[PDB]
């Protein structure tokens, strides 16, 4: 376990041979070094003798406790599960480093003395807000954008994969990335390919669900959220639809906008706090970019501002080609009549038409998709 971190010749050399031969002699020295201790000091088994001596110290009714202070000379005040706290002492098999206020520990039944500490059963919300797997396909699924994708790899992926380029430059990566445009323009869709691509611990949160009914529960949820993001790894925090904190008012919130405000203040701390931040990236996305506070949008808090335009028609045919790739297209159709049907159709619109047309074929048990499928299909999708 972490015996020798050096690998640097990386060849067939007498260097890499003599490494092990040295460490060979040291590990044999450890073997026959400890071998004499039981040869001339049997006196025990030492594999379970001292171990069950510890387990003969500690009783089987192991009560579960929680720290609240520390006095260094192995005694402290520890809170009971009832609440009536004590002033017990602490053992020598307690390996006194994992002791923080509020931690779960192991106590005696009788004198309630601090026997051991307890590993904490994670947290329900960490898994809830924690994204497990890659959602879907890569960046090749998107099509048409091809410029800001270089922007997203630029601020996000390239800092991860090539931390040589910033160092030869004498520079750090940009901090904050924001995404804005018309709705249905693939804003979340790009983040799915990011969540495909990355190996970092990924988090995703809607801007709508920040708001609470309890006072300060929002900002508390923020503080523990950034706690979770920082405590894990090179992490990617995504926020969708952050305008919804400013647009809609809900009567579940006891406070009005002057609690929403305080929520945005605590978040505004967590972007640009004086504390050492660490390796957490921030991707934001919405459609109403003009509405929120520009104080969150200052450089220092967000560096990169990324608009998503409406698709041009030669990109539209590409998006049709993507959403018609694996499907049994009957050759009755022409996609170019389908392009100019709406002047300002989204990429959600194309897939809506395609999938709904597949629903129309599955009404008639068919396998291929004909022209009138699209004819009545856009009647269903667009006009209502």
């Amino acid at each position: 376990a972490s015996k020798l971190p050096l690998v640097t010749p990386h060849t067939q050399c007498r260097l890499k041979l003599l490494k092990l031969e040295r460490i060979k002699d040291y590990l044999l020295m450890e073997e026959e070094f400890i071998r004499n201790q039981e040869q001339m000091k049997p006196l025990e088994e030492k594999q379970e003798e001292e171990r069950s001596k510890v387990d003969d110290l500690r009783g089987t009714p192991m009560s579960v406790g929680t720290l609240e202070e520390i006095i260094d000379d192995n005694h402290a005040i520890v809170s009971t599960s009832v609440g009536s706290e004590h002033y017990v002492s602490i053992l020598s098999f307690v390996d006194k480093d994992l002791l923080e206020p509020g931690c779960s520990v192991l106590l005696n039944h009788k004198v309630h003395a601090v026997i051991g500490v307890l590993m904490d059963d994670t947290d329900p919300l960490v898994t809830v807000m924690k994204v497990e797997k890659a959602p879907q396909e890569t960046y090749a699924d998107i099509g048409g954008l091809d410029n800001q994708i270089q922007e997203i790899k630029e601020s996000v992926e390239l800092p991860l994969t090539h931390p040589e380029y910033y160092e030869e430059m004498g520079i750090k990566p940009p901090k904050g990335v924001i995404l804005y445009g018309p709705p249905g323009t693939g804003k979340t869709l790009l983040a799915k390919a990011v969540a495909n691509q990355t190996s970092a611990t990924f988090l995703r949160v809607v801007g709508s669900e920040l708001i609470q009914k309890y006072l300060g529960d929002g900002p508390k949820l923020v503080r523990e959220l950034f706690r979770v993001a920082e405590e894990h790894a090179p992490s990617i925090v995504f926020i969708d639809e952050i305008d919804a904190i400013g647009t809609k008012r809900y009567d579940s919130n006891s406070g009005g906008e002057r609690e929403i405000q305080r929520t945005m203040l605590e978040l505004l701390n967590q972007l640009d706090g004086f504390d050492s931040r660490g390796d957490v990236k921030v991707i934001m996305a919405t459609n109403r970019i003009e509405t929120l506070d520009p104080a969150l949008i200052r450089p220092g808090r967000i560096d990169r501002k990324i608009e998503f335009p409406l698709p041009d028609e030669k990109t539209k045919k590409r998006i049709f080609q993507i959403h018609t790739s694996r499907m049994t297209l009957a050759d009755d159709v022409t996609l170019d009549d389908l392009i100019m049907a709406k002047d300002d159709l989204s990429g959600a619109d194309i897939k809506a038409i395609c999938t709904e047309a597949g629903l129309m074929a599955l009404r008639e048990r068919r396998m291929k998709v004909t022209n009138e499928d699209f004819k009545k299909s856009k009647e269903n999708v667009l006009y209502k």
Binding site: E290, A341, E379, Y383
Partner: protein
């Protein structure tokens, strides 16, 4: 005092402004109108909104307004707003006629109105009009003409246009059924009865629920005739016959 000022004139930080877009938002509701021509004559079809059983049903029209002796308009939007606009451009035609002793080119009339409508959008701190309208008329220069106003203050030359509640859905079939110069003023009639049949969510095509105006050129007349409700329903059932065989043969 300036606290009470609403600034109905300035731009948005995205460059546009919101007030006339609220107006053109409102013009999508409360009315259904269309016009069509390809030949001698031009037709207007307007769907009547108030269909309560206790109406005296007078004044010869609802959204149809004879402007000159050879041109007329069908209106859409807020009626009370429109009434000032109607007689407003009406004596502008009359001051043209007084000025030159001649009827007016329909297009240059429309421009002159759209200046005035454009002015409130431009300054004055003034609530504009949520009113858009069509234009039928005849001249010596181009004969039968068709134009379309916008509450923004710009206009458009067309031949056949609906500004209904389902206006683009109508337009989708309008560019699915037409012919340039050949849709005579019965073929465009039966086409139109299909169009209002389509965007009419109320089916069965109540003849009293619609209004249709005609503008033909008779030699020194330019006959503008709103046809009575004795001949709507024969065109209605005339559509109903061909739709039954037309469906049935498929």
């Amino acid at each position: 005092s300036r606290r009470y000022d609403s600034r109905t004139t300035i731009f948005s930080p995205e460059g546009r402004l919101y007030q006339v877009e609220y107006a053109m938002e409102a013009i999508g509701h409360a009315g259904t109108c269309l016009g069509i021509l390809a030949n001698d004559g031009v037709l207007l079809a307007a769907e009547r909104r108030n269909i309560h059983k206790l109406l005296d049903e007078v004044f010869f029209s609802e959204k149809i307004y004879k402007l000159n002796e050879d041109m007329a308009c069908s209106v859409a939007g807020i009626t009370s707003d429109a009434n000032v606009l109607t007689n407003e451009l009406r004596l502008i035609a009359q001051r043209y006629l007084l000025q030159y002793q001649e009827p007016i080119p329909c297009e240059q009339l429309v421009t002159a109105l759209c200046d005035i409508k454009q002015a409130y959008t431009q300054f004055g701190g003034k609530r504009p009009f949520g009113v858009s309208l069509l234009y039928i008329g005849w001249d010596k220069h181009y004969g039968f003409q068709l134009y379309q106003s916008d509450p923004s203050g710009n206009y458009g030359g067309w031949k056949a246009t609906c500004i209904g509640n389902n206006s683009a859905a109508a337009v989708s079939m309008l560019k699915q059924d037409y012919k340039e110069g050949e849709m005579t003023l019965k073929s465009a009639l039966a086409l139109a009865i299909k169009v209002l049949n389509k965007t009419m969510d109320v089916s069965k095509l109540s003849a009293e629920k619609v209004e249709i105006a005609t503008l033909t050129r008779e030699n020194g007349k330019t006959v503008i005739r709103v046809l009575k409700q004795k001949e709507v329903e024969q065109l209605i059932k005339k559509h109903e016959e061909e739709e039954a065989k037309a469906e049935r043969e498929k």
